Amino acid sequence: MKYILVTGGVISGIGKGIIASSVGTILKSCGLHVTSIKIDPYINIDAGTFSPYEHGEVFVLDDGGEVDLDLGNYERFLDIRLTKDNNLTTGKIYQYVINKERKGDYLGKTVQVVPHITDAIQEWVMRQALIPVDEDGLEPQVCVIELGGTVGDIESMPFIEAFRQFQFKVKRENFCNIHVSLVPQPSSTGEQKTKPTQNSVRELRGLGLSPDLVVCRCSNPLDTSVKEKISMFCHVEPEQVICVHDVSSIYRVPLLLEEQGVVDYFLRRLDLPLMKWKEMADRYDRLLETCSIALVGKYDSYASVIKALEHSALAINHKLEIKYIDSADLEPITSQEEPVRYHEAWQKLCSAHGVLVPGGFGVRGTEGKIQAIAWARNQKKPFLGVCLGMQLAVVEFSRNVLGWQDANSTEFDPTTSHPVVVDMPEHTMRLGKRRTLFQTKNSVMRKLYGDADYLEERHRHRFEVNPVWKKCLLKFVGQDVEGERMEIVELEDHPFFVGVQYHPEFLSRPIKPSPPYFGLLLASVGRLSHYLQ
Template identity: 70%
Template structure:
């Protein structure tokens, strides 16, 4: 059954237009029209508003909320729920005032004050009866199982605040100055760190700072970057585009491989791991990617367009794709629940050249996961290493707080010295013979949500 939810932050001036200016807020007009097509039982409007508290008086002000609600109604939308943000808990008198002047019931005013972590927010909303409110307003089939989920979520929030041990992960990327570029990666690492009862210390390292050119130009920055890398418990090399910074990434990969530091390469990180291994372990000094050197004599990574050759996004391999495990003896397969195949989201254009993978068969680097046709290399694993894994897909997109992404979980388990113990204690595979991203679940075994490793 269709369920629609419009979440707005007020006042409307901050939404891209002036009050009453519908052309400045086309999405508001679209939802105004959509509410009649979807009908009331399938449409829900949540309005988020700030309740400021000036330090001079200490009084919580409701006028901004009243004004934004008035402007929203002038645009043809009425809130079903008003969520009030504040630095301190909102007083009952203030809540009743908002209820009276905004023409909603008191139970339709929810208050969220600053809390110790974002994981506390759902607990705060549940305490104010939001689940029951949704159930009655939208006639949702919410059963007793939701209470168990909320209980586990509350336990997770409690555990997050009590974490004492810290795990340091070095993220070696090209866009570290714009850290929002790695927001999904950061959350996936945080989910996994919480699952293994450690607080995440994520150290951002610009890959250029690890290169010799930086040593000549700015030795202080060079040594600071390498000091971070040397003190990390694990190394992550995420995706990216272009030649800039790739040498620094490969140096970080080489460090993790030779020093037995847990490593995870995602997308470009996996491709560079293959190139680094070919250059340093297979005597293929000219191995390269055609993205960086179109005329390379050893095209180890090549352009494999999904559809027709062209420019930019039209050639990218996007969306949920199936990866088949080619061996039973795979760390990542065990982390996924010992399933024969998985489905993960992709976003790339270049891939490992399938015609050259035979050179790796006699060495320790194995392509343990491929697409259904065996033409696209999806997963690499290095034997005789605590954890050296590369994936062509982006598992961070499907990570959830209580269901961390298996590749990221493996990195944190290895970085904290718990990977072997965890793999030994894992139970039999789930009833289903596949791993799927359906309903946003990123992990095959539900009991993963309650992982607690001492």
Template identity: 70%
Template sequence: MKYVLITGGVISGIGKGVVASSIGTLLKSCGTRVTSIKIDPYINIDAGTFSPYEHGEVFVLDDGGEVDLDLGNYERFLDVTLHKDNNITTGKIYQSVINKERAGDYLGKTVQVVPHITDAIQGWVERVARVPVDGDEQEPDVCIIELGGTIGDIEGMPFVEAFRQFQFRAGKHNFCNVHVSLVPQIGHNPSLPHTTGEQKTKPTQASIRELRGLGLVPDLIVCRSVSPLTKAVKEKISMFCHVESERVLSVNDVTSIYRVPLLLNDNNVINLLAEILKLPIETPRRNRNLVKWKDLADRYDRLLKEVTIALVGKYTQLEDSYASVIKALRHSALDCNHKLNLKYVDSEDLELSTQHDDPVRYHEAWSQLCSSNGVLVPGGFGLRGVEGKILACQWARKTKKPFLGICLGLQCAVIEFSRNVLGWKDAHSTEFNSSTTKPVVIEMPEHNPGQMGGTMRLGKRRTVFQTENSILRKLYQNPKYVEERHRHRYEVNYDLVPQFEEKGMKFVGHDVDGKRMEIMELEDHPYYVAVQYHPEYLSRPMKPSPPYLGLLLAASGKMQNYLARGCRNSPKFSTDSDVSTSDEEIVDFASAKEGATSGL
């Protein structure tokens, strides 16, 4: 077993996850079996109880693991299915050690960070690294491990010490340390493309010095910078960091993350890893997978037509809060040969201006919503901003605007329909109003309110289609059922479903017991679809998620051609139609406000 440890220096958030995913992609393209592990030094057991503003989105795996969003990068790039044990946290390690201590496994010894915690980390890595992925009978050849945080962080010290020991445990040619560091460019002005600032190496030198002082020696240094490193800068880093100049890799800013594997390939990273790890890699002259990546990156750069999607959410101040949603939208837009113009609409701003005394933000929010080609209402928790999401659902329904609701988005669409079509003005979810006379969304019986972590309906579940006359079933290539990942505590009230369907809101997908409503489609609408699950978790750059693809097809005017061809070929081969918003489709603010008032 070979191990590649990815560490980071200078600052966090410089792209360790993308570098790790890209290295894995290159190795996999050469026929190497690859798995990944993400280490997060926080004491939480998992990411499930984080606020979206604290740590970005919570990514959910097939087995129900609530993990760091970087595991989403690994799954998307490598097209593999990982498990909750592929995410290691300080909380998990300490919990396992304490459980052993309580069971008497340490035979009365004093339990300490060294050796007990460090041994537990090494044992966990070895165990998980050997688990076959995606039904492969053989264990992986290479495990890529990303150590979260920055070298020098106090919470990461036990992990650094564990890997200092682990490099000897694994063996000389079985362990490689790739250190990702920032090379700032002082004086660089993006608005003046012909001017370049001076690339500063001191932060990288300091980071490598600290890494070496902790007992880890980098085999490769990946330098993140605005522009490609000059030869002189590479040689300077090589000299002061004791690494050969060809092992100093330049990863500068590029037009899309699809170009990062190609950039690393240009840096000869495959041959370098093969040399360091003694991997039996024979790089073909024309690697088919790399050709696909290059085609993907080239198409992304050549996109001319634009499609505008309004993301009506509660956590719009931080893009990482909707990382998988945004990537799923981009995958689908690219497949439709359109550039995604994503507008973030804070759902609170759509509510009546008298509620927050900021009419400017109110009108700007409605302007962005009304000028979009499609509307997406994603998941979320808590009462804040829910009425704004309900108003967005109402506007999309009444104006025939393409709409996709995810999780809470489905529930908001049901609440809106109950109030304005069925006439149940008090309709609500018991999550937000426990005393409502019309509980159209209710708490699931197995939800355990006594504990927050891991108590939702989590992981991959089966959804069975109830009819062949379903647009989403056609987009899924007409299967009898689909399996998607869930993360929710509340569900549509089954007892009220017949009254919804009588008025045209069809629940075309149920769970295997027929009691949970999983997919909703509205009659007499070009694309008004909502799902209880989170399809974004399974979206891939070259295999977009069908519900998201449907939204982008409808928003870009390609839906009918795609359906007419039996949903067989990629939408990029269909006839384009101009994406525009007619005067009739744009609701003026007075009408919007009148509609908003009627929805409350």
């Protein structure tokens, strides 16, 4: 193959996944088919168990892989569709080796981290690099592998040991390594402190990996002296020391790496055979008009959602002002303890141009989301409900229009006489890519989806709308292939009141915002009336 490893140096959060994604879009702009792998040094088999305050926004792949948000960054910088196993973990690789041991496949020998786990990592990286994850069935010409976390933590050591072997298993023309470090600039000092980068690259070389590129996460751009000091103490050429500094938009991060010569480097270094990103950045920096959108949440947990709104905003040509609202502040209980939280949350929601009610589980914020959907009905503010927001729209309709004031989910109040959304597992979770059929032409949503008869979108839910109560209910315009499951709902006599049972955000790209997020943004600025025209 051709491999680029991307290792983290000093801390997480420093945009290493944006660097990996930017390097992938740079390679793709060179005419290469490109795949990507995230290694997460946790013991978890997939992210499908995280409370979103830790490793927030589990991104759901077509196969039902509940993976880290960086896999979603890969799908948005590169036109790819990944599999579960593009998220590698210690849980997955140790369980693989343990099951393979119990099978007797290791032939009655000792099994131990070196070699056998570090072999298994290389086997995995070889497998997932061959898979044509790109928008055509042609084999990837390069694979960008990101090692999550910081090097020299106990969990990251097996993977660096595997890559230390890998660079001699495949030849050096087939394996490059980027180190993404931090160069802090303290309030206490004003200097750009290279010391952590030196010690991190010293540690990485102790684990037997050189940086071929040293990418410094700077705030403000590096001085020449600091770049030279990094080049010296990392024992690498200045041309291979990159600063990624603070820039006006995400769209400039590939352009900065381009300017920094990484394209030219990888072309020679791997012996290989962004004008839109200029436009997207320059377009963003000249958006004079604005749209204000309420996001009524519970939980970074809405990373894909925020990005989908920003794609939609860039496409309508407005700035976006996301009014982040805790849905538990909108609940009347908060007015008893902290009326300041209540009245700030309701000033936010009421001044919005439209509302977004994203997915989740558990009782927190449920009556607040039902009230934010109520506000969307009676004030006629444009509404999108995503996954849970759809279910709560059936609840809010039922309570006010049908007078079923008790009505709820079987999750939140199982004692209710009108369970209008019920537990309905797959005959497991409705998890991954399902096909929804549009049951009609009387849908703005169908027209936003290009007037297509069907769409295929990633779901992540156990509950569905009750088919008994459906007869009384609120036009369920999108339904599954079985007709068992309601997957898009649209309310009559409203500018834009849509529930989608799936997660549109997972298939939003800058070049193609998801049509429910686009329709919401278009509706909130009135421009939907010109779009459908």
